[PDB]
Amino acid sequence: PCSICSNNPTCWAICK
Protein backbone atom coordinates (compact mmCIF):
# COMPACT_ATOMS: atom_id res chain seq x y z
CA PRO A 1 0.00 0.00 0.00
CA CYS A 2 1.30 3.48 -1.08
CA SER A 3 0.69 6.46 1.31
CA ILE A 4 -1.56 9.43 0.17
CA CYS A 5 1.22 12.11 -0.12
CA SER A 6 -0.59 15.29 -1.29
CA ASN A 7 1.80 17.54 -3.38
CA ASN A 8 5.44 16.59 -2.33
CA PRO A 9 7.61 15.14 -5.40
CA THR A 10 10.21 13.11 -3.24
CA CYS A 11 7.74 11.10 -0.89
CA TRP A 12 5.69 9.35 -3.76
CA ALA A 13 8.40 7.16 -5.56
CA ILE A 14 9.64 5.15 -2.40
CA CYS A 15 6.69 2.62 -2.21
CA LYS A 16 7.52 -1.15 -1.75
Please work out, in degrees rounded to the nearest 5, the angle formed at the alpha carbon of residue 5 by the alpha carbons of 11 and 8.
Answer: 55
HEC states along the chain? Answer: CCCCCCCCCCCCCCCC
Experimentally, how was this structure solved? NMR
At position 8, the amino acid (one-letter code) is N
Specify whether the CB–CB gap between 15 and 3 falls below 8 A: yes
Specify whether the CB–CB gap between 9 and 1 falls below 8 A: no
Please work out, in degrees rounded to the nearest 5, the angle formed at the alpha carbon of residue 14 by the alpha carbons of 8 and 15.
Answer: 110
- Rounded distance between C-alpha atoms, residue 13 and residue 3, angstroms: 10
